[PDB]
Amino acid sequence: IPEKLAFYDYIGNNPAKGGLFRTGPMNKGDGIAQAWKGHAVFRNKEGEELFVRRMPAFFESFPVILTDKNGVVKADIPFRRAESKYSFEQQGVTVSFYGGELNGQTFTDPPTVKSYARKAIFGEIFEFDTETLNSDGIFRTSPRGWFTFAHA
Amino acid sequence: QTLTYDDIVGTGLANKCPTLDDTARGAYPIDSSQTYRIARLCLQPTTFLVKEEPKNKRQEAEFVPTKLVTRETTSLDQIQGELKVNSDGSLTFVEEDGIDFQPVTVQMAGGERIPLLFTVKNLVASTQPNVTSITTSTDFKGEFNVPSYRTANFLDPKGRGLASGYDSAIALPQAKEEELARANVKRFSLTKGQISLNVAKVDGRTGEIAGTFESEQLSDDDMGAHEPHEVKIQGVFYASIEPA
Amino acid sequence: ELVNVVDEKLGTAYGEKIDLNNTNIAAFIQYRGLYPTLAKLIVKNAPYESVEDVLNIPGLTERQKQILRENLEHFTVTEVETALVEGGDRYNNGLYK
Amino acid sequence: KLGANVGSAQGPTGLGKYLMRSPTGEIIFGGETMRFWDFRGPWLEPLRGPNGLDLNKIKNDIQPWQERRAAEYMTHAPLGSLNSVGGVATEINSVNFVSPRSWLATSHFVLAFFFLVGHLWHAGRARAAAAGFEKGIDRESEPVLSMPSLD
Amino acid sequence: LIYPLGQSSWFFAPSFGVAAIFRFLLFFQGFHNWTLNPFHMMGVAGVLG
Amino acid sequence: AELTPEVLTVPLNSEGKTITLTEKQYLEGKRLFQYACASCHVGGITKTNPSLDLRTETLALATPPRDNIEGLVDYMKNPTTYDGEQEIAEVHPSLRSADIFPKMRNLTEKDLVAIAGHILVEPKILGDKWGGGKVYY
Amino acid sequence: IFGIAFSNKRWLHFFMLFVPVTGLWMSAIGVVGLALNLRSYDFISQEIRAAEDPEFETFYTKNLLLNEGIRAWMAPQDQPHENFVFPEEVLPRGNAL
Amino acid sequence: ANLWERFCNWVTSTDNRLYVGWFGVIMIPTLLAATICFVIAFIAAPPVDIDGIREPVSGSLLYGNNIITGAVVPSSNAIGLHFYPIWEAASLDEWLYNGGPYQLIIFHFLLGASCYMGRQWELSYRLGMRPWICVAYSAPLASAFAVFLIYPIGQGSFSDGMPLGISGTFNFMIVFQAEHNILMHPFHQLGVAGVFGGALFCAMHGSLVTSSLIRETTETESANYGYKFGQEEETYNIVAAHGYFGRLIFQYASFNNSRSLHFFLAAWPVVGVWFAALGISTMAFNLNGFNFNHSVIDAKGNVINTWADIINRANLGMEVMHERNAHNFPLDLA
Amino acid sequence: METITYVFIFACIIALFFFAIFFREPPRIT
Amino acid sequence: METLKITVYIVVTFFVLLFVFGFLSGDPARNPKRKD
Amino acid sequence: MEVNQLGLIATALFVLVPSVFLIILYVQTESQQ
Amino acid sequence: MEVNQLGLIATALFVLVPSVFLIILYVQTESQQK
Ligand code: CLA
Ligand code: CLA
Ligand code: CLA
Ligand code: CLA
Ligand code: CLA
Ligand SMILES: CCCCCCCCCCCCCCCC(=O)OC[C@H](COP(=O)(O)OC[C@@H](O)CO)OC(=O)CCCCCCCCCCCCCCC
Ligand code: HEC
Ligand SMILES: CCCCCCCCCCCCO[C@@H]1O[C@H](CO)[C@@H](O[C@H]2O[C@H](CO)[C@@H](O)[C@H](O)[C@H]2O)[C@H](O)[C@H]1O
Ligand SMILES: CCCCCCCS[C@@H]1O[C@H](CO)[C@@H](O)[C@H](O)[C@H]1O
Ligand SMILES: CCCCCCCS[C@@H]1O[C@H](CO)[C@@H](O)[C@H](O)[C@H]1O
Ligand SMILES: O=C1C=C(Br)C(=O)C=C1Br
Ligand code: OEX
Ligand SMILES: [Ca+2]
Ligand SMILES: [Ca+2]
Ligand SMILES: [Cl-]
Ligand SMILES: [Cl-]
């Protein structure tokens, strides 16, 4: 898979994710993209492939919910813990990467798996240089968005 | 001559421990064959001191005065537990229950606010050996537990918590997580405090004692977000001892 | 590293069964005969070195002991987690419906 | 009843989950109802001593009739919708209830307010009529035209 | 017209109804933080003024 | 969809006998449940003790079992804690405590059956909404 | 009474046109922005301080928590084409409620 | 010639640049006190434990706020409706922690604004005017009483009074909707009709008078120079304006009587805002908006949602998140 | 810097109130 | 605090007395038309 | 607070440029015969 | 280049305040009767 094609499949390039007073280039938000990390594949202890529910453009924040191929919920990141049933720890959720930087690697440490799952709600996962521009981690719109706003 | 709730309400007396007369210089006999309990222990703080945190780290830091900002809500009371007679004649109080904590906020010179959970939770305190009678020479010394000032459900202003809440800074969706780990990953403190009780008055007839106390414990660490301060609390105490 | 001890506990038997040393008392409603009488006794006499130690609670009726025996397969024990047992949280953990 | 020691139970904020102190030290109920500690009622006063709510009476002396009354009053709180659906605003239909206290308070605030408006209306008119200008300004005798300019 | 045309579909336009419009208000608070917007604040000033 | 005889057929006893309620009985049960019970049990939850709800699966694991007409009718005469260990008529409305819960004074045996049938039929209509609380509103 | 007053009746009545008409025009501009999700949603300086300092709270951070509840609790039924299933455990809630 | 007689003459003098008057004797010190405390607190006050749970909220500019987020924060829920003047605190530091400034500001403000209203009566009497401008002002004033005093009384705490700040105002609105469904309350709906209609009729009257200005100026001068302050002739032709608007709708839908017209312009927003104020003041005692949650049911008994049920879902999100650490028991009863 | 900026603008507005009231163009009947 | 309280009480009483005695001082007659 | 470094110059010119425009026009009006 | 962040506002005000002073004086000179 070309890195350029994977990069289009990422919500940080969606022009409907910005803010009126979040000024500057998109690079000022998530950072200067360096490399595709590869495709994350999530699995539970049974070995079923699980899919992270992607964030719609409407949502500034979004929960982490994983389903099987039929849309049945299989794991999530709970808010309240005392009645959690689907936590990554309970379900033995792992993540393996195919292609990109992390190709051939597998992660089982629940905090690490959860961090990758949080990025997967944005689609394909990239490594960013957030230092060069002192990027703040908050999405900005593209020239497509700014052009559209001013002219409407 | 007996006061009621309506005599007391709004006066501040409800935060004050009972006192004994200047004539209460007696002695309460301990029968090593009898079992005893403290039916009521009351602790009324009169001074909060916070240890200054100097830069040099070779100068001896001092405890400095503070201003109480949370009003007359500080006293521990209705505390009870077993009062054991040990084989060597010492007495050990084992705290079991009561209103044995108070959140407190004091302010340093310059405005820094220091919240703490003023407490004697799970207090075990012992006297010197051979206490055939409790007198104005009796002392109690012991340790207690200091749990996290906030309990596990408490959510910070961005909705992050330990037993509930987000586990990341959701307003910074693509920021690097390593730098925010201390604020994102909530931790529950449990430390020890120390307390001394100096008996100053004893009513042998009624089993009541009163005196001064000093205790030392750590302050709120905001569920692990920052280092706690050392606090010294001074005040007066009252206790009623009963055969049980 | 910094770790959320409640999430970690979810990766132990605490995430699979009723932990006699940690679990909030409303969980004993999941099985017949445990709540409220045995559940109160269980929480009050915790912690336990093993699940079978629950049978040593003094004062039990014979039926009460039989109910415990039938439900040992649904119990576990892990180390007491301070964050789960402070604040009276085993009696009321701030969760209702 | 489940075994909690309600005196020593610390809530999430650090204040007592069930019991805390008023700003003047009295023992009072915790949670948001800390604001209501001035409340007094016959089902609650048996539990109150000189320093406020008495933990020993709470541990030992709560009668079934007190539990009954408290459950009744908790579930008949004066909250409900204009079409008389009892409960909080997010409640589903089922309970047909608006407290008589809500009907009586809302009606008489509405009436008291309009009667204040009526007082202003009629007081201002009676003054203007007594002075002779309730029908308007006399064009040939406009008071302001006989006054010095402000600047 | 413009708002739904910028969104995914007409579905997210206001529906023509009293409670439907109230939902539109609340959607705008929750999703857009519309009360924070200085152009809405100028609108409020113009209407209340 | 309709409120059919099959929907209105519910377990009569612990042995597996069923009974088919009439639509009149269903209407009577809703009315009487609102009259005497909804102030605490609206929607199948319990406002003064949210740990216990009126879901059929919860009632089935009560002692004695309460997931049938006879169990619910008995509960309304002599209510118990969930484990059957304590009689709670002094703090829960019942025929036994009609002196202190006066709304029970005029409830007939027929009324109790109707209330019991409402509690059993409603989850067959509403599913997990019944006893679900505000999450399911 | 107020310190200033109208003195020109033509200005007064023009001002009465100007004020509400300009107000509505401004609100329209904001909505054109919201068409693109170009919101005034956040103050970045607030988010940076709040993320690093868990004792920092303002009415601005309080309102975002309300917004997060609105989105999570209203989206499944308000946006049925999305087929949202949010298990109970993921729903943001404060204590007790 | 005696000092008290001379003083009374200056106080009630119609020649002061700003009228004082007897209401003014109360208004001036109370409004200055509220203004000075507000400005200082808004700039420099430390965080305030609004909800009484030792969770202080920062309101001031120096403590991390901007104009949009800053506020003077309501007094602590631990205080409730107790009177908390400065001399009740052990120290100014305690007074600030507990939200003392809020009580000082709103009490001085409400008294001063009530006196502002009486002052409007008073000057109108001194000028030989008719008296009811103060009645028009009673609508905004009643609204201020509603959110700063009546709602706190009904709920038992000044911590539920509206905060003195822009984002705090939005916080009050959102929580109010969660707890009272104010959008579904007809008095708030009348309020909206009052302010929407007030804005509409403001633009309407403005445009109609402006449309019928009599030509008195040249192409290069502002037409405003066609009116001279205090001229006796009307400056526009209301017969032309009515002839236009009566044809826009129909003849009888339009006003030809200027007195009737201007009475309508006064009455419509004032009445509507009166109902707005009464909305807040009666939801203060928890008589809330219409509740149609699960009102529509199909033949089996399935709930058929309406837009009211979607509103309910949004209200729930507000409810469960607001004051996330303050509730220990399952019902939010105040 | 921000605080200074906010207070500066506010202070200018209050000064503007003073001039607009006491140093207004006087209304004259002509 | 005690001094502050006494000071404010004195200040408030002064202005309140001005208000009451002011309106007692022949206020109906302070109009431009009929002297009541 | 980590504010935008251009906020100050943006606010300063936003006030000053139109304000001085108005002052220029006002003063040359006053100075007319 | 890591320049002083106040350099921009300082230079801008240094130009604009006295320039605007002169423009005010010039324009109100031109508008006086001739
Ligand atoms: C059609 C106009 C237009 C558009 C679509 C763009 C688009 C873009 N610009 Mg360019 N630019 C433009 C014109 C435009 N520019 C002009 C005229 C200049 C000279 C000033 C510039 C100079 C410029 C620079 C120096 C930079 C950009 C940059 C950018 C990128 C980021 C934009 C941003 O952050 O905006 C933020 C937008 C806002 C904060 C919106 C402001 C809304 C105003 C303030 C509201 C005013 C309301 C008014 C006061 C109310 C009146 C009310 C009254 C009637 C009553 C983006 C691709 C940046 C970049 O990334 O370069 C690589 C960058 O560094 N632009
Ligand atoms: C103090 C006055 C008062 C109060 C507190 C009550 C309270 C109650 N009534 Mg009673 N009643 C009253 C006067 C009052 N009523 C009057 C004047 C009549 C003759 C019409 C009645 C006849 C009556 C009947 C027949 C019934 C009740 C019922 C009830 C109960 C349910 C109320 C309801 O659903 O209202 C619904 C709410 C409304 C209809 C909204 C009214 C809003 C008005 C229009 C606002 C008025 C605004 C203001 C005054 C004027 C503004 C104009 C401005 C320019 C100045 C409740 C206890 C019911 C009950 O349960 O009995 C057991 C019932 O069946 N009442
Ligand atoms: C919103 C409150 C308010 C306002 C603005 C007015 C306004 C007016 N009143 Mg009314 N009045 C009111 C409430 C009000 N009244 C109430 C509740 C009552 C019942 C007790 C009265 C009984 C009354 C009588 C008997 C008369 C008036 C009259 C008048 C008119 C002449 C001015 C005057 O003498 O007032 C007097 C002022 C008052 C009676 C109270 C004013 C209250 C405001 C809030 C100021 C509070 C000031 C106070 C010193 C604050 C204390 C501080 C505290 C910490 C100690 C004027 C229209 C006179 C008139 O000409 O009628 C035709 C007249 O004779 N009023
Ligand atoms: C102080 C409270 C307050 C006030 C005064 C306003 C004021 C406004 N709001 Mg805001 N709002 C608020 C609080 C407030 N809001 C809060 C807390 C929220 C939650 C965030 C919102 C959410 C909100 C949203 C989502 C929107 C507004 C919008 C507006 C503007 C609507 C203008 C209008 O009249 O459109 C009314 C509609 C028109 C004027 C269109 C033309 C109407 C034609 C002429 C009607 C013809 C009818 C015909 C004769 C048939 C009649 C038939 C009959 C049977 C019905 C106005 C500036 C709207 C906006 O900004 O628009 C740009 C908008 O979309 N507000
Ligand atoms: C018109 C002048 C005026 C008025 C009416 C007030 C009113 C108030 N002040 Mg403010 N104050 C003022 C000027 C005033 N102030 C000035 C100039 C300063 C600077 C020195 C202050 C500094 C100040 C501080 C620091 C505080 C107050 C506080 C208060 C509140 C409590 C006052 C109290 O307990 O008095 C009690 C006094 C009496 C009860 C005696 C009144 C005696 C009269 C003669 C009897 C009649 C009373 C009765 C109501 C009749 C009224 C008549 C009317 C209806 C016609 C009250 C809102 C406190 C507050 O805001 O707490 C939240 C507070 O902390 N004031
Ligand atoms: C008890 C004492 C109360 C005093 C309180 C102080 C009141 C201040 C009143 C406004 C003074 C400034 C007016 C400048 C402008 C000015 O001097 O106007 C003077 C102008 C006089 O109008 P004329 O009809 O004489 O103008 C003739 C025209 O033909 C000119 O071309 O008045 C108006 O235009 C009224 C409409 C504007 C009313 C504006 C109200 C502003 C309210 C404040 C809004 C912002 C507040 C910000 C908070 C931080
Ligand atoms: C509040 C005042 C209540 C009213 C009115 C009614 N009930 Fe109730 N109910 C209430 C509580 C506090 C409890 C739990 C009691 C305990 O300690 O166990 C209950 C329980 C029930 C149950 C058992 C639920 C289960 O086993 O899962 C049933 C079947 C029940 N209640 C039915 C019921 C009926 C029919 C009522 C009206 C006639 C009624 N309840 C009123 C609180 C309250
Ligand atoms: C709340 C505490 C105060 C309660 C006071 C109750 C008073 C009841 C008796 C009032 C006695 C009347 O006292 C009244 O006051 C003042 C001072 O004496 C008088 O004196 C006044 O006379 C004239 C009247 O036109 C005024 O112009 C002048 O400014 C003033 O000197 C009034 O003419 C008198 O009528
Ligand atoms: C700690 C778990 C493994 C490392 C993080 C997994 C997500 S990936 C991570 O995401 C960052 C934004 O948060 C990017 O800035 C960065 O480039 C990228 O490595
Ligand atoms: C002229 C009005 C003065 C307004 C400011 C008075 C607050 S006093 C201020 O308090 C801060 C916090 O306690 C301290 O950090 C600081 O040193 C001190 O100057
Ligand atoms: O403002 C107005 C002027 C005229 Br003319 C009219 O007929 C209606 C209105 Br509203
Ligand atoms: O305080 Mn402000 O908000 Ca009136 O509800 Mn209860 O309290 Mn709180 O919660 Mn919801
Ligand atoms: Ca950085
Ligand atoms: Ca001693
Ligand atoms: Cl909130
Ligand atoms: Cl609570």
PDB file of N, CA, C and O in Angstrom, chain H residues 259-284:
ATOM      1  N   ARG H 259     -49.491  56.624  18.594  1.00  0.00           N
ATOM      2  CA  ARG H 259     -49.559  56.269  20.012  1.00  0.00           C
ATOM      3  C   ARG H 259     -49.818  54.778  20.189  1.00  0.00           C
ATOM      4  O   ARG H 259     -49.169  54.111  21.004  1.00  0.00           O
ATOM      5  N   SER H 260     -50.773  54.242  19.431  1.00  0.00           N
ATOM      6  CA  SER H 260     -51.029  52.809  19.440  1.00  0.00           C
ATOM      7  C   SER H 260     -49.778  52.034  19.038  1.00  0.00           C
ATOM      8  O   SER H 260     -49.388  51.055  19.691  1.00  0.00           O
ATOM      9  N   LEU H 261     -49.143  52.465  17.952  1.00  0.00           N
ATOM     10  CA  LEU H 261     -47.929  51.826  17.460  1.00  0.00           C
ATOM     11  C   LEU H 261     -46.855  51.762  18.539  1.00  0.00           C
ATOM     12  O   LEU H 261     -46.263  50.707  18.790  1.00  0.00           O
ATOM     13  N   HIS H 262     -46.552  52.901  19.156  1.00  0.00           N
ATOM     14  CA  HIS H 262     -45.469  52.904  20.125  1.00  0.00           C
ATOM     15  C   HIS H 262     -45.861  52.168  21.405  1.00  0.00           C
ATOM     16  O   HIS H 262     -44.990  51.613  22.078  1.00  0.00           O
ATOM     17  N   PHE H 263     -47.153  52.143  21.757  1.00  0.00           N
ATOM     18  CA  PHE H 263     -47.564  51.308  22.880  1.00  0.00           C
ATOM     19  C   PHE H 263     -47.290  49.838  22.589  1.00  0.00           C
ATOM     20  O   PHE H 263     -46.785  49.108  23.453  1.00  0.00           O
ATOM     21  N   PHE H 264     -47.605  49.393  21.370  1.00  0.00           N
ATOM     22  CA  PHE H 264     -47.336  48.012  20.983  1.00  0.00           C
ATOM     23  C   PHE H 264     -45.846  47.706  21.088  1.00  0.00           C
ATOM     24  O   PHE H 264     -45.450  46.684  21.663  1.00  0.00           O
ATOM     25  N   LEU H 265     -45.006  48.611  20.575  1.00  0.00           N
ATOM     26  CA  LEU H 265     -43.556  48.433  20.638  1.00  0.00           C
ATOM     27  C   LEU H 265     -43.072  48.320  22.078  1.00  0.00           C
ATOM     28  O   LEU H 265     -42.164  47.541  22.367  1.00  0.00           O
ATOM     29  N   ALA H 266     -43.660  49.087  22.999  1.00  0.00           N
ATOM     30  CA  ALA H 266     -43.307  48.911  24.409  1.00  0.00           C
ATOM     31  C   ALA H 266     -43.807  47.565  24.936  1.00  0.00           C
ATOM     32  O   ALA H 266     -43.045  46.804  25.555  1.00  0.00           O
ATOM     33  N   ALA H 267     -45.079  47.241  24.665  1.00  0.00           N
ATOM     34  CA  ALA H 267     -45.751  46.140  25.365  1.00  0.00           C
ATOM     35  C   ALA H 267     -45.211  44.774  24.958  1.00  0.00           C
ATOM     36  O   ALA H 267     -45.037  43.898  25.813  1.00  0.00           O
ATOM     37  N   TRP H 268     -44.986  44.553  23.656  1.00  0.00           N
ATOM     38  CA  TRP H 268     -44.638  43.211  23.191  1.00  0.00           C
ATOM     39  C   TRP H 268     -43.353  42.687  23.833  1.00  0.00           C
ATOM     40  O   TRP H 268     -43.387  41.607  24.444  1.00  0.00           O
ATOM     41  N   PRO H 269     -42.209  43.376  23.759  1.00  0.00           N
ATOM     42  CA  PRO H 269     -41.025  42.829  24.440  1.00  0.00           C
ATOM     43  C   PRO H 269     -41.153  42.832  25.958  1.00  0.00           C
ATOM     44  O   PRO H 269     -40.602  41.939  26.608  1.00  0.00           O
ATOM     45  N   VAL H 270     -41.823  43.824  26.553  1.00  0.00           N
ATOM     46  CA  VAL H 270     -41.907  43.877  28.013  1.00  0.00           C
ATOM     47  C   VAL H 270     -42.734  42.706  28.548  1.00  0.00           C
ATOM     48  O   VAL H 270     -42.351  42.045  29.519  1.00  0.00           O
ATOM     49  N   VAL H 271     -43.882  42.437  27.925  1.00  0.00           N
ATOM     50  CA  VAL H 271     -44.717  41.325  28.361  1.00  0.00           C
ATOM     51  C   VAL H 271     -43.971  40.007  28.186  1.00  0.00           C
ATOM     52  O   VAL H 271     -43.945  39.164  29.094  1.00  0.00           O
ATOM     53  N   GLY H 272     -43.351  39.814  27.014  1.00  0.00           N
ATOM     54  CA  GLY H 272     -42.621  38.582  26.770  1.00  0.00           C
ATOM     55  C   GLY H 272     -41.498  38.360  27.769  1.00  0.00           C
ATOM     56  O   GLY H 272     -41.295  37.243  28.256  1.00  0.00           O
ATOM     57  N   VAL H 273     -40.756  39.420  28.095  1.00  0.00           N
ATOM     58  CA  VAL H 273     -39.647  39.262  29.029  1.00  0.00           C
ATOM     59  C   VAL H 273     -40.165  39.076  30.452  1.00  0.00           C
ATOM     60  O   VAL H 273     -39.549  38.360  31.254  1.00  0.00           O
ATOM     61  N   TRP H 274     -41.305  39.690  30.787  1.00  0.00           N
ATOM     62  CA  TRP H 274     -41.981  39.358  32.037  1.00  0.00           C
ATOM     63  C   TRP H 274     -42.217  37.857  32.139  1.00  0.00           C
ATOM     64  O   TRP H 274     -41.897  37.226  33.156  1.00  0.00           O
ATOM     65  N   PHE H 275     -42.741  37.254  31.075  1.00  0.00           N
ATOM     66  CA  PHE H 275     -42.957  35.816  31.132  1.00  0.00           C
ATOM     67  C   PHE H 275     -41.634  35.057  31.188  1.00  0.00           C
ATOM     68  O   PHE H 275     -41.542  34.031  31.874  1.00  0.00           O
ATOM     69  N   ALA H 276     -40.593  35.541  30.498  1.00  0.00           N
ATOM     70  CA  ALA H 276     -39.275  34.921  30.668  1.00  0.00           C
ATOM     71  C   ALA H 276     -38.869  34.912  32.135  1.00  0.00           C
ATOM     72  O   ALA H 276     -38.527  33.857  32.689  1.00  0.00           O
ATOM     73  N   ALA H 277     -38.944  36.079  32.791  1.00  0.00           N
ATOM     74  CA  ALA H 277     -38.560  36.172  34.196  1.00  0.00           C
ATOM     75  C   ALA H 277     -39.404  35.242  35.066  1.00  0.00           C
ATOM     76  O   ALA H 277     -38.884  34.580  35.974  1.00  0.00           O
ATOM     77  N   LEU H 278     -40.701  35.152  34.775  1.00  0.00           N
ATOM     78  CA  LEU H 278     -41.576  34.282  35.551  1.00  0.00           C
ATOM     79  C   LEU H 278     -41.272  32.819  35.267  1.00  0.00           C
ATOM     80  O   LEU H 278     -41.498  31.959  36.126  1.00  0.00           O
ATOM     81  N   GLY H 279     -40.791  32.522  34.060  1.00  0.00           N
ATOM     82  CA  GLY H 279     -40.293  31.207  33.725  1.00  0.00           C
ATOM     83  C   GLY H 279     -39.189  30.794  34.677  1.00  0.00           C
ATOM     84  O   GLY H 279     -39.317  29.779  35.370  1.00  0.00           O
ATOM     85  N   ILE H 280     -38.120  31.594  34.762  1.00  0.00           N
ATOM     86  CA  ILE H 280     -37.034  31.255  35.681  1.00  0.00           C
ATOM     87  C   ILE H 280     -37.547  31.210  37.117  1.00  0.00           C
ATOM     88  O   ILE H 280     -37.186  30.316  37.899  1.00  0.00           O
ATOM     89  N   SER H 281     -38.386  32.180  37.486  1.00  0.00           N
ATOM     90  CA  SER H 281     -38.845  32.314  38.864  1.00  0.00           C
ATOM     91  C   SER H 281     -39.820  31.221  39.283  1.00  0.00           C
ATOM     92  O   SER H 281     -40.033  31.044  40.488  1.00  0.00           O
ATOM     93  N   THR H 282     -40.460  30.524  38.340  1.00  0.00           N
ATOM     94  CA  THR H 282     -41.314  29.399  38.723  1.00  0.00           C
ATOM     95  C   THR H 282     -40.630  28.053  38.537  1.00  0.00           C
ATOM     96  O   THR H 282     -40.908  27.121  39.301  1.00  0.00           O
ATOM     97  N   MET H 283     -39.720  27.930  37.568  1.00  0.00           N
ATOM     98  CA  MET H 283     -38.835  26.773  37.577  1.00  0.00           C
ATOM     99  C   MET H 283     -37.910  26.806  38.785  1.00  0.00           C
ATOM    100  O   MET H 283     -37.374  25.762  39.171  1.00  0.00           O
ATOM    101  N   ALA H 284     -37.772  27.971  39.430  1.00  0.00           N
ATOM    102  CA  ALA H 284     -37.088  28.040  40.721  1.00  0.00           C
ATOM    103  C   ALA H 284     -37.736  27.133  41.749  1.00  0.00           C
ATOM    104  O   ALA H 284     -37.076  26.705  42.708  1.00  0.00           O
TER     105      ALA H 284
END
